[PDB]
Amino acid sequence: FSYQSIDSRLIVDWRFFGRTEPKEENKLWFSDKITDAYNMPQPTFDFRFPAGRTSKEAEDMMTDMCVMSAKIGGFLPGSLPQFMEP
Amino acid sequence: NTVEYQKNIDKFVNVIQGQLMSVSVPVNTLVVDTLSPTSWQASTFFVRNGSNPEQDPLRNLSGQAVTRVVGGMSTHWTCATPRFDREQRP
Amino acid sequence: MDIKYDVVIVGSGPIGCTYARELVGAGYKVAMFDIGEIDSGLKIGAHKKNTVEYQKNIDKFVNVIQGQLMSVSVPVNTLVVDTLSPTSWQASTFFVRNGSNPEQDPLRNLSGQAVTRVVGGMSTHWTCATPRFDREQRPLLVKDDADADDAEWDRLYTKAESYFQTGTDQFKESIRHNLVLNKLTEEYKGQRDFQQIPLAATRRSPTFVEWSSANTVFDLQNRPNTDAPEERFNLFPAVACERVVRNALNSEIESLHIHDLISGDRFEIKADVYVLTAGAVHNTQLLVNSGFGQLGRPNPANPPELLPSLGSYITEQSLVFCQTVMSTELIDSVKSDMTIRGTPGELTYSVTYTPGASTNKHPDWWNEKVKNHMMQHQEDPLPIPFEDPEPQVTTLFQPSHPWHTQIHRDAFSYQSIDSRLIVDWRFFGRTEPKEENKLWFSDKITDAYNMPQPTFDFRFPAGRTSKEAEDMMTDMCVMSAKIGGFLPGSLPQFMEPGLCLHLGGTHRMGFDEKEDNCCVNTDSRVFGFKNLFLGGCGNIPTAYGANPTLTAMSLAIKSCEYIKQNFTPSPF
Amino acid sequence: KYDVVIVGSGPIGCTYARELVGAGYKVAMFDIGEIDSGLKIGAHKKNTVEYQKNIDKFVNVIQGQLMSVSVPVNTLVVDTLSPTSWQASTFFVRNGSNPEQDPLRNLSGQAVTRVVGGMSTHWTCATPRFDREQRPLLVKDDADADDAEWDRLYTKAESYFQTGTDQFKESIRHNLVLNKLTEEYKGQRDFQQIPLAATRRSPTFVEWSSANTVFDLQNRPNTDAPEERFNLFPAVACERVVRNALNSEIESLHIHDLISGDRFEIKADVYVLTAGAVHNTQLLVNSGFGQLGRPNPANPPELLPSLGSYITEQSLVFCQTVMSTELIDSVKSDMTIRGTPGELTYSVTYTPGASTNKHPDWWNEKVKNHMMQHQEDPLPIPFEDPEPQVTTLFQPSHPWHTQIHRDAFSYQSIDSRLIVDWRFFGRTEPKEENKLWFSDKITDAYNMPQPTFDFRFPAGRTSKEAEDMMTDMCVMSAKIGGFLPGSLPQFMEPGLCLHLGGTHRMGFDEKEDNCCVNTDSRVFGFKNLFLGGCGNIPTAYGANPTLTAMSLAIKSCEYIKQNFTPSPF
Ligand SMILES: *Cc1cc2c(cc1C)Nc1c([nH]c(=O)[nH]c1=O)N2C[C@H](O)[C@H](O)[C@H](O)COP(=O)(O)OP(=O)(O)OC[C@H]1O[C@@H](n2cnc3c(N)ncnc32)[C@H](O)[C@@H]1O
Ligand SMILES: *Cc1cc2c(cc1C)Nc1c([nH]c(=O)[nH]c1=O)N2C[C@H](O)[C@H](O)[C@H](O)COP(=O)(O)OP(=O)(O)OC[C@H]1O[C@@H](n2cnc3c(N)ncnc32)[C@H](O)[C@@H]1O
Ligand SMILES: *Cc1cc2c(cc1C)Nc1c([nH]c(=O)[nH]c1=O)N2C[C@H](O)[C@H](O)[C@H](O)COP(=O)(O)OP(=O)(O)OC[C@H]1O[C@@H](n2cnc3c(N)ncnc32)[C@H](O)[C@@H]1O
Ligand SMILES: OC[C@H]1O[C@@H](O)[C@H](F)[C@@H](O)[C@H]1O
Ligand SMILES: OC[C@H]1O[C@@H](O)[C@H](F)[C@@H](O)[C@H]1O
Ligand SMILES: OC[C@H]1O[C@@H](O)[C@H](F)[C@@H](O)[C@H]1O
């Protein structure tokens, strides 16, 4: 699950995954009016990563991937360090 | 687990993408102002193309998707199966 | 800086310079103000393309243009950026950011519209195309006498062409230009006629063209000077003109309020005559900021009392665009008269032609250029010389094809294929004036110069404008195919509304303020006011497809005749 | 006939003119480009009201006057042409490309500016001093005397450029970034304002310095300088300096007037080349110094064998960040806020002069007023707050220069107040195999030998440090906020930093130091030929080199004043 000129033998993927504090306000709810392709109540999210520890860890995580990955090689242009879509 | 995918692993990304159906897509507000003057042109950002008008685009999990096939997501997953240490585990 | 002048001009674009040329020449004590600054070099207001370096590197001038096109009205951005780090500050709403205009409906905008604040205005970067309008595109200057109307326009356009040094033969020695011109002529035989774009430009050498500008019109030097010892002219750059002060009677302007942007001070300036030539957008802003028309979101419940048509009936052209890659048949035809022996790079390789042979398809000069290129550059696979000037071709607007056309190479692009093969196609539509198409100004939001923020409420009219626009696209597709296929990455497309920068009708001309729904008369005098004149493309009230500047200059010359006949120059 | 001819009207040529016109010499200067900054000749193009109100547009002006040095033949495959279009059979030389250039050993980002004032008409104006580790020796074996020499020259160079470190002190964004970084490094690194060649005129306008600041480029004699002699000749391509048979003296400058097309042979007592690191080397090689053509070690050059060798260009890493929620909240830490913005009950207050406030009154007054007058806006930073201009200078333990700032040369939906640029610049070891050379067959747009690079960042310390530098940017930036999507941490194209050095390098001894000019910037063997610019710098440096170049130029002018007499007026 990628997200062609450099030889593939040289390429390494780095994925670092954070932990998220459970918070009552982070919700999955379902429309009483809008329906999905199967005529079921449409799923809706109301989500943000919690401030405090989740957010501080997430950024520390990014830094750590940057620090660690450098021991193996530089970044591949077009695959630079990034948060992926939530 | 086909001979062909394992000789052409760069193409399996497409199998995954073909079976990840987005959970909640907000109403699209991209401005397309280079339509020809004869084409039908929207006056508002109305609910189009399966979008969910209930969804705040700024409070979403836009990447969340589901897989409807026998075997579910295990028909395409990366197969990583670590244990949780006490700190992560109920 | 004095307090009192005979004439004050707002803006140093080519239309402002038309007034300066005519009135400074007739002995008036003239002051001119520009909100922008002198940057073009020692020739004040000159074309920025007129350097040796830009003409050896023409691909880089696009950046000069882009650096001085400031968008008119940018809507509030609603792009979703959901990959910020969790620690970054993250918006809860699409709030007003980065200079955007919350009054602007993104779906009823002229997003491509932009302005240029520098001495010489847009003429410091323009493409210099200056066609005449035919009767179908042009406002009447004489009623009920078509021949007299045609005679008056011909007199005015002749003088405007002289001012701009308009010509139609600067590109006559280009191989590319003639290859494309001749092919189109042949393809439409007895249906349409093709010619060189009329261009405000003077060739200086086979590789350098002196493109015209405001500075060609009037050189913008302060006078008196050694070469004009009885003339009086002062240019004042970095001066924001903010208001013309009306009397209570709305019969006369009493002063011009200016903001010196270097010192920060504000001053009143007095003149006998006031000329506003700040562009289509900024003339209208200045007038609205001064009590003309209506400030704020339009309200038919409360029509304005002064100049009710100001900012209404605005027109902007539809523009279609593509690039092509010259056909193999055309490239082969360039070298049709050559005899070729051997293979390039070999000691006996030979490319020859017979000068004067009655069976040649090309003149001797053409064949000499080809033969020399092919012999001096045997590594190169094209018969076209490296220095060959670009094509500059048009078929002008006609009733059976009611759009202007440019078949050319524009510095304002929108690298692997050889440049000699590439031709630009731009076709420009005419837009019906409609009361509902408006330029208005916020009563709350202000621009970078703390002036009421311009807002558009615009769509291309249904009916004829829209049908023509699409027919126009089809025509560019049909025509361009005679020359070559489309260039990948420059496929046929409508460009962003307003990118063509041909906005008209924002302070439009007519015979009668009420019956013609207009703001100025045929002398460009604002109805009701004795000493206030507007110049520029905002004056044009018709649906036009051709480039408007020459038309606007022609109306300015007519305005100057009224001024010279009704106001007396002070004694020196 | 002139006392002194200078080639190039950049800031380094202007340093020679300032020193030498002032000392009474009859000076001519030539530039291949034209006057195009307005009536202040060679001034910064950013010093218009309109650019400083629309700063996002100035990147275009920069791009418009960066002409690539060496572009390799294009091999992109376009296979979706119509069947009727002329379609190439090979990847032939198209569109100004250089066939001599290996695309994989280039400095593709390298570019030159042909305008009067040169690159100083658009530059960023960062003028740091080099510390001893980055800096060439002017005195050997006496560090104190070396330090005193440099301190003197750099002080004079700062005066010419009007360098200051205070122009941004009233920016909230600047202070927010600086204070956080100094807190986080617990004394291990010092943060300060980038030294900038600029004078603030108002809270919303800075007069950026340029060549014009150094020397106004007006012909003399004039009313202001009735006893001085200076003539500027723009649109004049300088092509060769003519050597006597002894290779001890230059006898003439051959020029090409681009407007008339004519060629002339100009005589001077003293010849100064200040045409840039690329174009100084081009002119010298077109004159019989060094070696013309592809390097050929079997036929070593007779004159200046080190010319075009030991070239250095810096590694550059870049990203942008979006300010952290914690920092933005800290802006308003002294405020008492009640109610909801937009409603009648809403209020923002602070106590003036309270000793427990984190910020001074100016800051709190700005933030209070912004918050009460613009209740539709969700940020506590005023609209017109100036940009950050922060650096921690190169040190043995972090051997790179840093800029934490807002550059006009970027590389929309997020509020600009939140955005900060990061540029970290590495030092590059001089190696004899890193070369700028000139084709013996291919010519450029001025009919001069086409420049060609043969460059790779040296393995060993340069490469280790480049990667350590990238990590350091990633670690430091994270203290301020996360990366801005679309401006992720990356290496920029080689040479886009435009810090090229060592192409005509300085040393004490031509042979032992593998160099071309002495510490007076005089070409070895030649009595009356001097070079100025970043080409003279022989060391591995990471800071912006112009100030150091200017300092060497002042020293060169001193030599000239000690050794040549001006003609009587
Ligand atoms: C897509 C994917 C998934 C994962 C990885 C990579 C990518 C690209 N890699 C990965 C994963 N997990 C790991 O632990 N290690 C990794 O390396 N991925 C996630 C993993 O694949 C899932 O966590 C796991 O399948 C979940 O198993 P499940 O709880 O059994 O759920 P599924 O989604 O697999 O199957 C659900 C199932 O039910 C069906 N369905 C849905 N709605 C209905 C209704 N109303 N009626 C009847 N049936 C229903 C679906 O069709 C489906 O098959
Ligand atoms: C940018 C451009 C423009 C055109 C072409 C190409 C492109 C990329 N090509 C072209 C054009 N027109 C043609 O007929 N043929 C073509 O090939 N272009 C448009 C042309 O350039 C304009 O139509 C013409 O300049 C308009 O002349 P103008 O009426 O004199 O207006 P300008 O915008 O040139 O100058 C206005 C002037 O006033 C100043 N200003 C604005 N506001 C104020 C205030 N409040 N105070 C004082 N001064 C003000 C501006 O700074 C400016 O210089
Ligand atoms: C473009 C750029 C440059 C700099 C920064 C940012 C950007 C986008 N920022 C910057 C720089 N330097 C710093 O120390 N701090 C910063 O924050 N930039 C580099 C700086 O701008 C240059 O180092 C400096 O100008 C070099 O000065 P110079 O040695 O005087 O050289 P120039 O390139 O400025 O001027 C040379 C001059 O000579 C002309 N020329 C070239 N060839 C000829 C020939 N054959 N005959 C005649 N004249 C010639 C050029 O036209 C030019 O004007
Ligand atoms: O997009 C602005 C346009 O203005 C028109 O005047 C020119 F003719 C076009 O070629 C183009 O430059
Ligand atoms: O005046 C308000 C406060 O400002 C802060 O910035 C100072 F550090 C305090 O000492 C105090 O002066
Ligand atoms: O890429 C050119 C660079 O020049 C450097 O000197 C500046 F410091 C950078 O900000 C950048 O503009």
Numbering used by the authors:
A (entry chain B): 454 to 456, 461 to 543
B (entry chain B): 92 to 181
C (entry chain B): 43 to 456, 461 to 618
D (entry chain A): 46 to 456, 461 to 618
Sentences from the paper on this structure:
In this context, Trametes multicolor pyranose 2-oxidase (TmP2O; EC 1.1.3.10; for a review, see) is of interest since it can oxidize both β-D-Glc and β-D-Gal to the corresponding 2-keto sugars, which are intermediates for production of D-fructose and D-tagatose. TmP2O is a homotetrameric enzyme produced by lignocellulolytic fungi and has been assigned a role in lignin degradation. The reaction catalyzed by TmP2O is of the ping-pong type involving a reductive and an oxidative half-reaction. Therefore, to evaluate and compare the productive and competing sugar-binding modes for oxidation of Glc and Gal, we used crystal-structure analysis of 2- and 3-fluorinated Glc and Gal derivatives bound to the TmP2O variants H167A, V546C, H450G and H450G/V546C.
Based on the overall more similar kinetics with Glc and Gal, we expected the V546C mutant to behave structurally more similar to H167A (and the wild type) than does the H450G variant. The C1 hydroxyl of 2FGal is exposed to the catalytic residues His548 and Asn593 in the “wrong” configuration for a productive catalytic event. Moreover, in V546C–2FGal, the interaction of His548 with the β-configured O1 group of 2FGal pulls the O1 group and forces the pyranose ring towards a nearly planar configuration. Why then do H167A and V546C stabilize 2FGal oriented for 1-oxidation instead of the 3-oxidation mode of 2FGal? A possible explanation could be that H167A and V546C are unable to stabilize the α-anomeric form of 2FGal. In H167A and V546C, His450 is forming two possible hydrogen bonds: His450 Nδ1– water and atom; and His450 Nε2– Arg472 Nη1; which positions the His450 Cε1 atom to face Asp452 Oδ2. For H167A or V546C to be able to stabilize the α-anomer of 2FGal, additional space is needed near the carboxyl group of Asp452 to accommodate the axial O1 of 2FGal. To achieve this, Asp452 would need to move closer to His450 bringing its Oδ2 atom within 2.8 Å of His450 Cε1, which is too close to be energetically acceptable. While this could explain why H167A and V546C are unable to stabilize the α-anomer of 2FGal oriented for oxidation at C3, it does not explain why the β-anomer is not stabilized instead. Possibly, the answer lies in the tendency of these variants to distort Gal towards planar configuration at C1.
